Amino acid sequence: LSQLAAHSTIPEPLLLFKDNRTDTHPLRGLSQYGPYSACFNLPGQVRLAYLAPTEHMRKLDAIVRELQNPATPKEATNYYVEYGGFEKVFKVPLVMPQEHLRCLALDECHGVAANGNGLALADKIVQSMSGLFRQKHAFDVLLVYLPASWKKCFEYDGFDLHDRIKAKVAPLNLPIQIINDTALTRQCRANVMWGVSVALYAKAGGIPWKLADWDKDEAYIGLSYAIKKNAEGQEYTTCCSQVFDPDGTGFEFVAYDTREFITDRKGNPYLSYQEMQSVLSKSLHLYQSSHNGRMPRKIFIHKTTHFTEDEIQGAFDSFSSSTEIELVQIIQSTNWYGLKVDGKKGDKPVAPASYPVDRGLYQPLTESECLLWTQGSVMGVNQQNPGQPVFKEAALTPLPNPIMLRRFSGNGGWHATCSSILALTKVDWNNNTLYKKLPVTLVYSQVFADVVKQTPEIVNEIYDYRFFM
Amino acid sequence: MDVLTDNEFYQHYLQNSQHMMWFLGAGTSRSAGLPTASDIIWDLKHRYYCLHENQDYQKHDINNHAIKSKIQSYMDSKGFPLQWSPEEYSFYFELVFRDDYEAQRKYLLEALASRKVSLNIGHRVLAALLEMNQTKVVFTTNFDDVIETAFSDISGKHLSVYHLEGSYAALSALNTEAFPIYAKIHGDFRYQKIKNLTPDLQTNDREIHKCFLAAAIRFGLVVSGYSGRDENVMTMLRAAIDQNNAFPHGLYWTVPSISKSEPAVQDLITYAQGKGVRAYLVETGTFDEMLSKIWRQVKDKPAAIDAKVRTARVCPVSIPLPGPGKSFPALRTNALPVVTQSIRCGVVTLASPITFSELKERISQKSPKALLTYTEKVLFLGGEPEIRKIFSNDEINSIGQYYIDEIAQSVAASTFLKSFVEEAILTALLREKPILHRVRHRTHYAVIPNASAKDDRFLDLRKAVGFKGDLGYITGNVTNAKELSWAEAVSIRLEERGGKLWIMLKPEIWIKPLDRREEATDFIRSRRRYRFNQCSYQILDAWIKILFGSIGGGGTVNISCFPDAEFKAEFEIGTRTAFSLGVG
Numbered sequence A: 001l002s003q004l005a006a007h008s009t010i011p012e013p014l015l016l017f018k019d020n021r022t023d024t025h026p027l028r029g030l031s032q033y034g035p036y037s038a039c040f041n042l043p044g045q046v047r048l049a050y051l052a053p054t055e056h057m058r059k060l061d062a063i064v065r066e067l068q069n070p071a072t073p074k075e076a077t078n079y080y081v082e083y084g085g086f087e088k089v090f091k092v093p094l095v096m097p098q099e100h101l102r103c104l105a106l107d108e109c110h111g112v113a114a115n116g117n118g119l120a121l122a123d124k125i126v127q128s129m130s131g132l133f134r135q136k137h138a139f140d141v142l143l144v145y146l147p148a149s150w151k152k153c154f155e156y157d158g159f160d161l162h163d164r165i166k167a168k169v170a171p172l173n174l175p176i177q178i179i180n181d182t183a184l185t186r187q188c189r190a191n192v193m194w195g196v197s198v199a200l201y202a203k204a205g206g207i208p209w210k211l212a213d214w215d216k217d218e219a220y221i222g223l224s225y226a227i228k229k230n231a232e233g234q235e236y237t238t239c240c241s242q243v244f245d246p247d248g249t250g251f252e253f254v255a256y257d258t259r260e261f262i263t264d265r266k267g268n269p270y271l272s273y274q275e276m277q278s279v280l281s282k283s284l285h286l287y288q289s290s291h292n293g294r295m296p297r298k299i300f301i302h303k304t305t306h307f308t309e310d311e312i313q314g315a316f317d318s319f320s321s322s323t324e325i326e327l328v329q330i331i332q333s334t335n336w337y338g339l340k341v342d343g344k345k346g347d348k349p350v351a352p353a354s355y356p357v358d359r360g361l362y363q364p365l366t367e368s369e370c371l372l373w374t375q376g377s378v379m380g381v382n383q384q385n386p387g388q389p390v391f392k393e394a395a396l397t398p399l400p401n402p403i404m405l406r407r408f409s410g411n412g413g414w415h416a417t418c419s420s421i422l423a424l425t426k427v428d429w430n431n432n433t434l435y436k437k438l439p440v441t442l443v444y445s446q447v448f449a450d451v452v453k454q455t456p457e458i459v460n461e462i463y464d465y466r467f468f469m
Numbered sequence B: 001m002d003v004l005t006d007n008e009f010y011q012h013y014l015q016n017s018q019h020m021m022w023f024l025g026a027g028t029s030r031s032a033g034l035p036t037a038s039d040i041i042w043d044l045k046h047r048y049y050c051l052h053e054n055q056d057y058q059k060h061d062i063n064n065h066a067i068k069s070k071i072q073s074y075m076d077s078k079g080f081p082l083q084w085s086p087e088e089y090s091f092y093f094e095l096v097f098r099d100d101y102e103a104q105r106k107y108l109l110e111a112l113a114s115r116k117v118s119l120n121i122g123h124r125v126l127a128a129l130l131e132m133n134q135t136k137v138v139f140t141t142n143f144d145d146v147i148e149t150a151f152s153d154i155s156g157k158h159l160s161v162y163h164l165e166g167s168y169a170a171l172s173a174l175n176t177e178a179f180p181i182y183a184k185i186h187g188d189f190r191y192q193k194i195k196n197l198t199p200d201l202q203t204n205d206r207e208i209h210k211c212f213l214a215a216a217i218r219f220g221l222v223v224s225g226y227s228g229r230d231e232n233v234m235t236m237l238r239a240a241i242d243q244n245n246a247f248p249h250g251l252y253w254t255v256p257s258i259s260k261s262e263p264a265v266q267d268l269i270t271y272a273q274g275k276g277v278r279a280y281l282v283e284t285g286t287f288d289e290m291l292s293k294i295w296r297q298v299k300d301k302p303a304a305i306d307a308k309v310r311t312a313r314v315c316p317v318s319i320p321l322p323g324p325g326k327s328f329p330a331l332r333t334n335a336l337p338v339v340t341q342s343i344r345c346g347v348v349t350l351a352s353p354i355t356f357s358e359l360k361e362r363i364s365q366k367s368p369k370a371l372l373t374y375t376e377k378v379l380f381l382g383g384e385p386e387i388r389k390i391f392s393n394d395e396i397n398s399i400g401q402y403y404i405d406e407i408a409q410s411v412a413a414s415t416f417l418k419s420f421v422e423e424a425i426l427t428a429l430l431r432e433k434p435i436l437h438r439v440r441h442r443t444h445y446a447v448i449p450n451a452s453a454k455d456d457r458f459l460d461l462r463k464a465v466g467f468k469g470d471l472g473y474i475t476g477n478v479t480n481a482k483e484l485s486w487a488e489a490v491s492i493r494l495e496e497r498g499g500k501l502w503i504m505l506k507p508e509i510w511i512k513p514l515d516r517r518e519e520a521t522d523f524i525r526s527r528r529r530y531r532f533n534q535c536s537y538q539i540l541d542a543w544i545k546i547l548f549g550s551i552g553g554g555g556t557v558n559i560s561c562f563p564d565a566e567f568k569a570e571f572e573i574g575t576r577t578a579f580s581l582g583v584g
Ligand SMILES: NC(=O)c1ccc[n+]([C@@H]2O[C@H](COP(=O)([O-])OP(=O)(O)OC[C@H]3O[C@@H](n4cnc5c(N)ncnc54)[C@H](O)[C@@H]3O)[C@@H](O)[C@H]2O)c1
Pocket: A285, B025, B026, B027, B028, B029, B030, B031, B034, B035, B036, B037, B038, B039, B141, B142, B143, B144, B186, B187, B188, B224, B225, B226, B227, B228, B229, B230, B255, B256, B285, B286, B287, B288
């Protein structure tokens, strides 16, 4: 026999908006209700700044003007809702910059970009950026436009021009937003409009939405590493960490550089007992500072690679003895895929379904492994024809691919872990779609480690999330 | 100036661990659950700021490090007390609450009642260091029992406390050299009226003050987790500095971050250096980090103490247990179970050892009809004439068979053996069939032959690959290429999951040259665009019934690899693909 136990489905998580209203569709909830309001937080006047050649300043001004005017999906997009302008939705004015905040680079970067150069272009951008630091206290978010001629040398197998510019800009606490040629092109205004407006508000300091299930007391920590080469040819590892509340947020990191680490035959590093203990102790210190001395009762630790015997003991020696610690490993690629076979009713016997598996289905396999989907059919979010499921990924892959979760600790219960991962999937503010394939902790920690890796020196500081990402 | 690395403040401590006394604070109890004074003060400040409900609530939204600085600057604008000052606590309390002693009591009974106080690594390490006589004198300003509980748990006995009651005993015990002492010191003129302290208790406080002075006359201070909020403690420290030959082995002030230090501690360190005392402002991270790095190099560790300090071995308690389900909406996988935990293999011993690369190149040059393994000893599943025929050399000793038991764990551990088993299974599978065999990237496929792409054996595959019930094409050539012949294929992999062996199938299409894959990928995308659930079900069923004999019987088909040989392999792969249904 080949009966693979029993599966279960997690109901689609709900989001929280202004005046305590809930909806599963982020864009629709923003349209009808507006962003989450907590005190003032001072995104009361989102002031922008420009950094682009004056020959390309007109298009940036045009897109900024378009940000304050309504736009329409223009077709049966099946997901996107009509954009009502920045005054609508966000309930906050957007201020165009004046002449005083129009810094630019004159002519040095064109020939360099035509030659495919790296660090020097970033340093010249940094010098103009310092010219703007002479006036920092005039705006909240900064807009940077890099033309296709500079896109020519955007990256080469590693180093990325925008990534390194952001790496050199972040440690001095000022946010930036990269606008590339795709946003001006692609002739689908509504799709672009929702993707940039939310990011601007998030980087200004606001909170677009928030998970509606926040009463539980837990925390989620995501770890990622990046191999960097410092001076005098020595290998170093930048283990970045980030802690979340059951309602997303998570505004701070712990960036830590280490030397004591083994490496398997794939380049994946493994921290020793002391390094893992130090990283987790600093993470707990960060969490306690931002929550007025509160300690979580349960802690989830998500990592892409497995946990060594030393790393498990290192984790248990960082928190108190009355805190339940549960370690989960998430694997992106799996050899399994699933098909839905419904039917019966009265008409006909069983037959394959017209649409793929549900998003929230999870299937336990063994004593330590489970198959969570986080990708597939989702109902109740259709805008073209209501009452029909939308796969939302029929263009890339005709069938969804599950992900595998392995647990190296924890008492019991697949439901809590799968629900937490599914809920954390929906709270990424840089994407305009419903969900992502991976929980936000892993992707955030990975991109932040990638940004930190490009620093020349050894960093052991605590950063903010607006200035990165 | 007067800054040392953490490494520098780990060799000095290792030598002089016996001549050191500790001055703790509220930061050495923050990791145990109890909030410090800074947390309470910040809570009061952001409540007053109208950042949240300014009457009674919790769950602040954003604290950050920019919002905190904005709030502190806004407070300082009106003329509020400077940061890190003793006046700040009571001033902010009175400002926020404005009398209403009942509301004060509700706030303190809501912020510190349901706080599960629990031990951390640093407290256990300090208790252990108090047990084995390495550290003698410990001073603190806390109103908790973390260290006492740690000592009780680690040792089993009770700690000797010399607070306000029995204060005169501290100096007597120090002179008589009663080593484990844990003396507490009160705050700034406000805890006295909290407990209605008589002037005799004030005389007691200066009693522990003389205790500190005389202890410094003979020890070194490693004060950690302190911010300088009190001025009585700072005055006592200054008086201790003023004593001749104060702290002979040096005074260390450990902070989690130098860039976030306090001006008062900098002033104290500068004064101590000016008077001629070995004072340094070291940065050793958190308290747990410092105490664990100290405990690493502690020598002559008793076995019981070491076992009690660090966490025991974490058992594999990660054992959730599922059960069968009963509901109609089901899920069909792509895995076929394999039930045969026993194979018979042949072996041969070589007088001269050979490497994997040499065996592979010899096979490539002298291709037999046999399979070989390469980890350290060659195991084969071929024929006796062939094994004599391959590399010959007459270095053979014995051909005694080697039974393979519980192949699951061996496949899970090794990698070459898993590939060998997969190759044997596929060779048994494709025997006596017209389907091809390709080994691209160790991901064995099964390509439909173009020569015979008209048999009724593939009629179902053509039917299930067409549109709207019409027959399709399972073999052809790419549109803009005359040398890019394509054919429907399936990839067969072997996977191990918790003691069971599965065979994973995946529909795919195959390209003949294998070196021109760009337009091949474009063609793959264009072909696979419209292959949804209903089409994938039919394609999988067609491939399964093409490969594994026939279905409908619902049993376990049997395949044999080289059936007419002394060393064959038999498998019992099931026909039905694993499914699941449940909830209910
Ligand atoms: N646990 C208690 O009994 C308690 C709690 C709060 C206040 N108080 C009272 O407040 C008064 C002043 O206390 P204070 O001087 O400690 O003020 P404080 O609370 O501001 O001291 C905090 C200092 O310790 C550091 N710190 C915080 N967490 C740390 C960690 N995990 N590791 C290492 N260092 C860390 C902080 O950076 C800061 O410098 C005392 O009279 C004391 O009785 C006592």
